[PDB]
Amino acid sequence: EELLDLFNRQVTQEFTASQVYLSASIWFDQNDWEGMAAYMLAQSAEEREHGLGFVDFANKRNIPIELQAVPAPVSCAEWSSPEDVWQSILELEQANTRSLLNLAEAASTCHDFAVMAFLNPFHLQQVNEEDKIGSILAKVTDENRTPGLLRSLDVVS
Amino acid sequence: EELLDLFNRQVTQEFTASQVYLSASIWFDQNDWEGMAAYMLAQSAEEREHGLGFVDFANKRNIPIELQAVPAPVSCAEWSSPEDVWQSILELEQANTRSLLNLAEAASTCHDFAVMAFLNPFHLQQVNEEDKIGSILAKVTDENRTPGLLRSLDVVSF
Amino acid sequence: EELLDLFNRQVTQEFTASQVYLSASIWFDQNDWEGMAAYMLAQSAEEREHGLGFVDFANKRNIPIELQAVPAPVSCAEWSSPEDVWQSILELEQANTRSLLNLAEAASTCHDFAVMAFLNPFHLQQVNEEDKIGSILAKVTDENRTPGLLRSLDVVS
Amino acid sequence: SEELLDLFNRQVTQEFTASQVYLSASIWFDQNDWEGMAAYMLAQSAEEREHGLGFVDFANKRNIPIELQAVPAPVSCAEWSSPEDVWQSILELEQANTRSLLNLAEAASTCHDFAVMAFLNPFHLQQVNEEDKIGSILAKVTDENRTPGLLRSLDVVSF
Amino acid sequence: EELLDLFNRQVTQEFTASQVYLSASIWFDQNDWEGMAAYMLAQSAEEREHGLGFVDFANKRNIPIELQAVPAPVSCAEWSSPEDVWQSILELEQANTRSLLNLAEAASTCHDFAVMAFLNPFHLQQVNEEDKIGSILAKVTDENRTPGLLRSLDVVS
Ligand SMILES: [Fe+3]
Ligand SMILES: [Fe+3]
Ligand SMILES: [Fe+3]
Ligand SMILES: [Fe+3]
Ligand SMILES: [Fe+3]
């Protein structure tokens, strides 16, 4: 069943995103961007909580869960500036949104009303998340046009 | 119309479930499982509340409600152990779930977005209810393997 | 450099352990041992926090961290009773202890006093964790000699 | 006092027109990720609408007929490209708002309508404060916008 | 003996450092960087307190202490900008860490477990102090790329 397989891959996707946020924290902390690092660390935790949510629902609903590897984050190897990091995180959130939308499609095809209901808050959360990341990325891209200025976003905010 | 019929039948299923839980509470009380009896009594009241919620929504949405009989419960003629009661209550919740899904399917066919939205919290509640009853039945079935041990479920929890 | 490699592997081991504990919670929840499931979930969180503490220290100490894959837990394929799960968790904590000891050994060799100091509370925590898991496993093993008895004591927890 | 009754009715429209232009500014700022400036505009939008409601309440009490007109579509958003453009349009809006109220007070003065002139006094003084506040913001925005990225500071810190 | 001489010279190093931090406060104050000046003054007091801790332990352990002169700070004649000050302070903390690491080596060689235990919090504090100073220096160095911008680090933060 497409639906059971996708529900499992959603758990992996949440944990994958958690680890990618952790890699963003690390790059920021290594590069003395402690404010952005804390933001990424908080978002790492929150993603993991989302994965845990999906696991809990699956257990209740008898959707078998088999935990997959969480792959090593790949984007950090090539980030060189905060703009690079934030662009990768926007791309992650966009991918997280698609995965959830595909899962909802599969649920809709199956008439799985409970799964569709469970997913509603996550669809609305993703709208907010993509908006928030895109907005920070816009500020970062504007501020980084003047040397040193972005270092103000971090220290302030 | 199918949606209107299924929405009435839902009120009926909630009130019928309420009575079946009441029946289970009686069986337990009569057999000195006061803890399981109190649990069933609480669930009886809650399933009546769900029915009342459906009635309220229907009144607001001009869905005509014709209250049907609540049939005499009959599974409590045959119960001879707590496991038998909990199995029936599991089957009851599985029937409750099915009736909500039937109603949602009809709302979906009709593009009745308001009804589908109203139903969402009930779909999620049924997931929790079937899980919870399933888990209790697993405990009962395991503990009843040693004589007297299930009386500990009743006294300790519940 | 051996100390750096080992410090990275320790991060990996904490996050691996975190995932094995999650696996344990899933098995328990699926088999209606909700109390044991909650215990495993809490431990899963805590071992991820340990990982985070290693990453934080590394960042401060300029120990480069590159996040590795977190492997798929595999023991939940073979579990068929709580005893099996708790035994795998004991072995996991024994392995967590060994990785910390390998790390400390390398730091000692390198005369890395700060790393050794950082490790001390973890060495002491591992004593506690192996003792606690050993104690639960003994209790589980003894209670399950009578059908149903073990269930009655997940329920009291 | 047909002139006066007319202009008083017309002042409701002006307040609601201003409310919508502020809303428009809030939208432009949100769409372009100036959430601080967007919140300021949204608040002013609400306050403009309250001013209109005050006019309506007073008219009801004074038996000045109110007939609600179309609230015109804001149009300056088509051509805004930077925050400076937006704030300049909002200054123009407030200057127009001030003139409309002074034209109304002129018609009242002519009619010896002491009550209407008294009703308007706090509004004349509010407009003084609002043109000053907007002009001051526009001066800041214009200066900060001389260095790339710096204005994005104002939004994030202040606002 | 060498452990005893090194313990004495650790006291001197702490007081030396306190005076270098004082010098940094003076340069900042003189050049109207009141925020950085306050940071340096606070760090000067703290390093004097570390020296006092060493003295107190020495007295307890019958390690004779003979207070040495506190040398005049020398870097404060060359400093021309905040970057130069923070760089000298990083170097000071790097020297602080090396002095503690030499003392720990001597104690290790002597099997002096009490001295090693006493030093552990200091080892971990140095990790934090070098990270914090290095991070500030990174911020200073970036922000100073734009005329006047650094003067906002100070007044704001
Ligand atoms: Fe997420
Ligand atoms: Fe119900
Ligand atoms: Fe751990
Ligand atoms: Fe107004
Ligand atoms: Fe010190």
Numbering used by the authors:
A (entry chain A), C (entry chain E), E (entry chain D): 2 to 158
B (entry chain F): 2 to 159
D (entry chain H): 1 to 159
Q: What's written in the study?
A:
Ferritin from the marine pennate diatom Pseudo-nitzschia multiseries (PmFTN) plays a key role in sustaining growth in iron-limited ocean environments. Typically formed from 24 subunits arranged as a symmetric, hollow sphere, ferritins take up soluble Fe2+ and catalyze its oxidation, with the resulting Fe3+ being stored as an oxy-hydroxide mineral in its central cavity. The di-iron catalytic ferroxidase center of PmFTN (sites A and B) has a nearby third iron site (site C) in an arrangement typically observed in prokaryotic ferritins. Here we demonstrate that Glu-44, a site C ligand, and Glu-130, a residue that bridges iron bound at sites B and C, limit the rate of post-oxidation reorganization of iron coordination and the rate at which Fe3+ exits the ferroxidase center for storage within the mineral core.
To explore the role of site C in iron mineralization by PmFTN, Glu-44 was substituted with glutamine and histidine, residues that occur naturally at this position in other characterized ferritins. Three crystal structures were obtained from E44Q PmFTN crystals soaked for 5 min (E44Q Fe (5 min)), 45 min (E44Q Fe (45 min)), and overnight (E44Q Fe (o.n.)) in an aerobic Fe2+ solution. Reducing the Fe2+ exposure time of crystals to 5 and 45 min resulted in iron bound at sites A and B at lower occupancy, with the inclusion of Asn-97 in the coordination sphere for Fe-B. Site C remained unoccupied (data not shown). Iron was not found within the B-channels in structures from crystals with shorter soak durations. Substitution of Glu-44 with glutamine resulted in the loss of iron binding at site C in iron soaking experiments. In the E44Q variant, this rearrangement occurs ∼75-fold more rapidly than in the wild type protein (and ∼30-fold more rapidly than in the E130A variant). The overall mineralization kinetics for E44Q PmFTN showed that this enhancement does not translate into a large increase in the rate of overall core formation.
